[PDB]
Design an enzyme around this catalytic site. Structure first.
Site, PDB file in Angstrom:
ATOM      1  N   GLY A 111       0.813  -1.362   0.058  1.00 21.98           N
ATOM      2  CA  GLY A 111       0.117  -0.039  -0.016  1.00 21.98           C
ATOM      3  C   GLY A 111       0.943   1.134  -0.046  1.00 21.98           C
ATOM      4  O   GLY A 111       1.744   1.335  -0.376  1.00 21.98           O
ATOM      5  N   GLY A 112       0.094   2.421   0.622  1.00 22.36           N
ATOM      6  CA  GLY A 112       0.921   3.413   0.663  1.00 22.36           C
ATOM      7  C   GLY A 112       2.357   3.757   1.355  1.00 22.36           C
ATOM      8  O   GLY A 112       2.910   4.403   1.048  1.00 22.36           O
ATOM      9  N   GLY A 126      30.535  13.899 -25.950  1.00 23.21           N
ATOM     10  CA  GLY A 126      29.833  14.891 -24.796  1.00 23.21           C
ATOM     11  C   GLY A 126      29.851  14.318 -23.476  1.00 23.21           C
ATOM     12  O   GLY A 126      29.617  14.926 -22.469  1.00 23.21           O
ATOM     13  N   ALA A 127      30.460  12.920 -23.466  1.00 22.48           N
ATOM     14  CA  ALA A 127      30.744  12.323 -22.026  1.00 22.48           C
ATOM     15  C   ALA A 127      31.523  13.118 -21.183  1.00 22.48           C
ATOM     16  O   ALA A 127      31.601  12.863 -19.994  1.00 22.48           O
ATOM     17  CB  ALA A 127      30.805  10.969 -22.062  1.00 22.48           C
TER      18      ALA A 127
HETATM   19  C1  LIG Z   1      -4.388   0.359  -2.283  1.00 20.42           C
HETATM   20  C2  LIG Z   1      -3.618   0.684  -1.088  1.00 20.42           C
HETATM   21  O1  LIG Z   1      -2.532   1.166  -1.246  1.00 20.42           O
HETATM   22  S1  LIG Z   1      -4.052   0.280   0.334  1.00 20.42           S
HETATM   23  C3  LIG Z   1      -3.296  -1.214   0.705  1.00 20.42           C
HETATM   24  C4  LIG Z   1      -4.179  -1.913   1.957  1.00 20.42           C
HETATM   25  N1  LIG Z   1      -3.393  -2.634   2.802  1.00 20.42           N
HETATM   26  C5  LIG Z   1      -3.661  -3.700   3.645  1.00 20.42           C
HETATM   27  O2  LIG Z   1      -4.916  -3.512   4.219  1.00 20.42           O
HETATM   28  C6  LIG Z   1      -2.886  -4.853   3.588  1.00 20.42           C
HETATM   29  C7  LIG Z   1      -2.585  -5.716   2.354  1.00 20.42           C
HETATM   30  N2  LIG Z   1      -2.932  -7.039   2.493  1.00 20.42           N
HETATM   31  C8  LIG Z   1      -2.860  -7.762   3.519  1.00 20.42           C
HETATM   32  O3  LIG Z   1      -3.672  -7.736   4.620  1.00 20.42           O
HETATM   33  C9  LIG Z   1      -1.693  -8.768   3.534  1.00 20.42           C
HETATM   34  O4  LIG Z   1      -2.057  -9.756   4.170  1.00 20.42           O
HETATM   35  C10 LIG Z   1      -0.472  -8.195   3.994  1.00 20.42           C
HETATM   36  C11 LIG Z   1      -0.013  -6.790   2.986  1.00 20.42           C
HETATM   37  C12 LIG Z   1      -0.701  -7.614   5.360  1.00 20.42           C
HETATM   38  C13 LIG Z   1       0.711  -9.247   3.991  1.00 20.42           C
HETATM   39  O5  LIG Z   1       0.328 -10.129   4.552  1.00 20.42           O
HETATM   40  P1  LIG Z   1       1.219 -11.183   5.621  1.00 20.42           P
HETATM   41  O6  LIG Z   1       2.587 -10.318   5.249  1.00 20.42           O
HETATM   42  O7  LIG Z   1       1.229 -12.497   5.086  1.00 20.42           O
HETATM   43  O8  LIG Z   1       0.607 -10.858   6.979  1.00 20.42           O
HETATM   44  P2  LIG Z   1      -0.586 -11.442   7.450  1.00 20.42           P
HETATM   45  O9  LIG Z   1      -1.910 -11.008   6.601  1.00 20.42           O
HETATM   46  O10 LIG Z   1      -0.774 -13.134   7.115  1.00 20.42           O
HETATM   47  O11 LIG Z   1      -0.826 -11.331   8.890  1.00 20.42           O
HETATM   48  C14 LIG Z   1      -2.047 -11.870   9.694  1.00 20.42           C
HETATM   49  C15 LIG Z   1      -2.313 -10.936  10.952  1.00 20.42           C
HETATM   50  O12 LIG Z   1      -1.849  -9.720  10.579  1.00 20.42           O
HETATM   51  C16 LIG Z   1      -3.076  -8.582  10.664  1.00 20.42           C
HETATM   52  N3  LIG Z   1      -3.231  -8.126   9.376  1.00 20.42           N
HETATM   53  C17 LIG Z   1      -3.107  -8.771   8.073  1.00 20.42           C
HETATM   54  N4  LIG Z   1      -3.320  -7.806   7.127  1.00 20.42           N
HETATM   55  C18 LIG Z   1      -3.902  -6.752   7.591  1.00 20.42           C
HETATM   56  C19 LIG Z   1      -4.503  -5.428   7.137  1.00 20.42           C
HETATM   57  N5  LIG Z   1      -4.768  -5.247   6.057  1.00 20.42           N
HETATM   58  N6  LIG Z   1      -4.993  -4.713   8.206  1.00 20.42           N
HETATM   59  C20 LIG Z   1      -4.819  -4.995   9.459  1.00 20.42           C
HETATM   60  N7  LIG Z   1      -4.402  -6.029   9.991  1.00 20.42           N
HETATM   61  C21 LIG Z   1      -3.785  -6.949   9.140  1.00 20.42           C
HETATM   62  C22 LIG Z   1      -4.306  -9.642  11.240  1.00 20.42           C
HETATM   63  O13 LIG Z   1      -4.717  -9.194  12.331  1.00 20.42           O
HETATM   64  C23 LIG Z   1      -3.748 -11.086  10.998  1.00 20.42           C
HETATM   65  O14 LIG Z   1      -4.042 -11.466  12.411  1.00 20.42           O
HETATM   66  P3  LIG Z   1      -3.387 -12.961  13.049  1.00 20.42           P
HETATM   67  O15 LIG Z   1      -1.942 -12.563  13.814  1.00 20.42           O
HETATM   68  O16 LIG Z   1      -4.319 -13.439  13.813  1.00 20.42           O
HETATM   69  O17 LIG Z   1      -3.140 -13.539  11.690  1.00 20.42           O
END
Ligand SMILES: CC(=O)SCCNC(=O)CCNC(=O)[C@H](O)C(C)(C)COP(=O)(O)OP(=O)(O)OC[C@H]1O[C@@H](n2cnc3c(N)ncnc32)[C@H](O)[C@@H]1OP(=O)(O)O
Ligand SMILES: *C(=O)CCCC[C@@H]1SC[C@@H]2NC(=O)N[C@@H]21
Lengths: 91, 507
Positions: free
Chosen positions: B170-171, B405-406
């Protein structure tokens, strides 16, 4: 040197103060042979190295006191760099 | 329950963060926690934690539940010192909501960003985040905007270093684009906007996590990450060493440190590095290592744009930046990728008063449609601009080729340089003898005889030197001595330029 022990000791010193870097050299082999108990006594044959190193050259082997000296030197030198890193001109 | 008991209970939870079971998993994966990383980075006992008791204020979607109340709200912030020098840090904690960014999360980071700018101390961030915290919605988007605003405001004021210690999505992935250096950890850290799940859903392409945004990709091919380190412990050890090169603020001169390496020694090893035959390559790094104090050189992006070498070193105690060509790769030609890495490095060093040393050996530009259609013209202007606008000492030595030119792009004297040295093997010309003579004597007889006369007169560094392009022609063994002398007298240099709201880089 004037005697057999003086020439050998001076050779040992010259080898440790002899800087060769950029290539692989054979100083480790020369430095260990000249200090070998058979070499100092003179029980050397034309096949000397083949019986001393039957499995190849392995490098100088450290004893207890030499390991303690190497560890103390390496540790003190490590810290010397860590202390030099902190001496800045005052801003 | 007394207030002191409640305080102690909050302190214990803040240290555990996401909890012991999460911490256990953190280690199983081969990662350190956010607090363990800081303890390694900073001088022992120097770290002071701020806002340890701050919690989120979001009550929606069950966020009001006690199970969600993690003191610290997924970031550890505070200040300390590295080798006695003040630095501000923050580290994102992946074990608390996945390291996602909340409103309060950003606020704490911004607070550090504001104190560092006010006093003039670097900020080092340790980033690891899953992206925005969707439970708060648009609050986290404002968080990113405020962080971005501080990162832009701090540019050219304090160094900004970002070390990636895990995934980033994301951001969050844009903050390393605003800081000065980005570092990663091999096979542990990632940089991407969307994950492979989106790529597969949007387009018919098959990719995994490492291929899409792994450390190897960004240090070898995209040119985004400046260097990846094998693991967390080695990454922070090298980060401490890197930190010691930089000033605390752009208002400060390049740091000077105790040095035992005599400044007036010769380096005989240089006299024979450059072959007399023009088609034989040599390793430019051999020259760089022999000149710099105690043969220590910090190389940036070792695996990306290998035809140009940039990095940090010291000479007579003073930090300098070094730029030079690598004749071993693509004959030492300039191309799009090399211009991007070069211009970025030169501009940082100029902004923070770090002198530049240039080692020139460049036969021209990489030809071909791959570069023409890629905007080689627009991109090459980046390196020329970065040198031309520099106001810090610039010492250029030409070791062999400088055609076309380099010559001017690689910080020639007429771009307000201070000194320009040539080695006896240098040759400065608009082009080589073959092109120049066949064009000059086009359609004439006995061109080869005319070429022999042309080579004898022009295939050497003299027609440029006698016109004032070169200040001296020096025995290569004396290069270090000459540079040391110039650095210690150009350090007091000040120049003026017409006022401009801001610079307008060609982009
Ligand atoms: C378009 C934009 O730019 S905005 C992008 C928005 N970004 C997001 O919301 C996150 C992107 N997607 C995800 O959530 C992905 O899972 C990522 C990026 C976090 C990577 O995942 P991983 O590195 O495998 O971590 P994973 O999601 O497996 O982690 C699990 C734990 O983290 C937390 N978690 C995971 N993703 C999120 C999230 N997006 N928001 C909040 N908490 C999260 C959960 O509470 C979960 O709890 P657990 O300990 O019971 O499992
Ligand atoms: C032989 O075909 C001549 C090759 C050109 C020499 C090199 S390659 C790219 C640089 N541009 C240029 O005109 N000279 C340099």
């Amino acid at each position: 040197g004037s005697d057999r022990t003086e020439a050998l000791k001076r050779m040992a010193d010259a080898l440790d103060n002899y800087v060769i870097r950029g290539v692989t050299h054979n100083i480790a082999l020369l430095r260990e042979v000249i200090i070998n108990s058979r070499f100092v006594k003179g029980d050397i044959s034309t096949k000397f190295l083949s019986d001393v190193y039957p499995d190849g050259f392995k490098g100088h082997m450290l004893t207890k006191s030499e390991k303690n000296q190497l560890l103390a030197i390496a540790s003190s030198l490590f810290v010397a760099f860590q202390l030099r890193a902190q001496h800045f001109q005052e801003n | 329950t007394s207030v002191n008991e409640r305080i102690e209970n909050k302190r214990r939870t803040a240290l555990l963060g996401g909890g012991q079971r999460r911490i256990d998993a953190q280690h199983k994966r081969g990662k350190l926690t956010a607090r363990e990383r800081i303890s390694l980075l900073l001088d022992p006992g120097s770290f002071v934690e701020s806002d340890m008791f701050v919690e989120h204020r979001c009550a929606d979607f069950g966020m009001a539940a006690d199970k969600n109340k993690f003191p610290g709200d997924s970031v550890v912030t505070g200040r300390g010192r590295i080798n006695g020098r003040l630095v501000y840090v923050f580290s994102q904690d992946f074990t608390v909501f996945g390291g996602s960014l909340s409103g309060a999360h950003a606020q704490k980071i911004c607070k550090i960003m504001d104190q560092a700018i006010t006093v003039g101390a670097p900020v080092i961030g340790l980033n690891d985040s899953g992206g925005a915290r969707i439970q708060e919605g648009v609050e986290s988007l404002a968080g990113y905007a405020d962080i971005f605003l501080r990162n832009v405001t701090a540019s050219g004021v304090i160094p900004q270093i970002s070390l990636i210690m895990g995934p980033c999505a994301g951001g969050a992935v844009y903050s390393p684009a605003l800081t000065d250096f980005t570092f990663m950890v091999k096979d542990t850290s990632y940089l991407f906007i969307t994950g492979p799940d989106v790529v597969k859903s949007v387009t018919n392409e098959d990719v995994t996590q490492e291929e899409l945004g792994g450390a190897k990709t960004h240090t070898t091919m995209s040119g985004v990450a400046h260097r990846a380190f094998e693991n967390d412990v080695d990454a922070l050890c090298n980060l401490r060493d890197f930190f010691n090169y930089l000033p605390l603020s752009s208002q400060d001169p390049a740091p000077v440190r105790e040095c035992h390496d005599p400044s007036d020694r010769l380096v005989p090893e240089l006299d024979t590095i450059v072959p007399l035959e023009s088609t034989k390559a040599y390793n430019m790094v051999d020259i760089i290592h022999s000149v710099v104090d105690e043969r220590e050189f910090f190389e940036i992006m070792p695996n990306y744009a290998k035809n140009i070498i940039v990095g940090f070193a010291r000479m007579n105690g003073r930090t300098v930046g070094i730029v030079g060509n690598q004749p071993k790769v693509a004959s030492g030609c300039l191309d799009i990728n090399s211009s991007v890495k070069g211009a970025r490095f030169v501009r940082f060093c100029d902004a923070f008063n770090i002198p530049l040393i240039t080692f020139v050996d460049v036969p021209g530009f990489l030809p071909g449609t791959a570069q023409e259609y890629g905007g080689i013209i627009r991109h090459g202007a980046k390196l020329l601009y970065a040198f031309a606008e520099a106001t810090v000492p610039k010492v250029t030595v030409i070791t062999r080729k400088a055609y076309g030119g380099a010559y001017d792009v690689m910080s020639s004297k007429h771009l307000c340089g201070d000194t320009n040295y040539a080695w006896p093997t240098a040759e400065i010309a608009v082009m080589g003898a073959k092109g120049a003579v066949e064009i000059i004597f086009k359609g004439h007889e006995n061109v080869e005889a005319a070429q022999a006369e042309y080579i004898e007169k022009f295939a050497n560094p003299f027609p440029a030197a006698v016109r004032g392009f070169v200040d001296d022609i020096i025995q290569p063994s004396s290069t270090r001595a000459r540079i040391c002398c110039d650095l210690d007298v150009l350090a007091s240099k000040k120049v003026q330029r017409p006022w401009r709201k801001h610079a307008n880089i060609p982009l």
